[PDB]
Design a protein around this nucleic acid. Structure first.
Length: 76
RNA sequence: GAAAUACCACCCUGGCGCGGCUGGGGGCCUAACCCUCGGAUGGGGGGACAGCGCUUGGCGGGCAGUUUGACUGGGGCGGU
């Protein structure tokens, strides 16, 4: 519950195979948004069930609430 | 209410837009090919077909080459 308050963000693919989560604030340092995007990269990557065959992380992006929507290459 | 609603995200059920891949089929030719003409190496009919080469799957006695056991007061049929 502690992390629920200090920083949490969970995972849960919805009906069609997708997840959503907070990985950086708006006015928040760029490098930061980067790092969190990352921690998510990882835990997600881990969750990756062994039932995957091929292009698993199909579409990975950053989009806001009411705003822009652009994919990100969590590689670089 | 099992869900909440703005406007921005991804993902599907379903139909239409367009584009790269490739599956299905319907039309005279034509120059390879075949038959060709009818008295000439030029004309004629057919022509991308089937002839034919190879690889494919399948009918398939017409053919080939084997096999279709031992016991048991014969063999076999009967038993086993």
């Amino acid at each position: 519950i502690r992390e629920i308050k200090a920083g949490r963000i969970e995972f849960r693919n919805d009906k069609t195979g997708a997840i959503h989560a907070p990985v950086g604030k708006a006015s928040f340092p760029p490098e930061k948004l980067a790092d969190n995007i990352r921690a998510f990269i990882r835990a997600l990557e881990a969750h990756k069930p062994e039932g995957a065959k091929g292009t698993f992380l199909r579409s990975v992006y950053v989009t806001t609430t009411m705003g822009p929507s652009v994919r990100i290459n969590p590689h670089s």
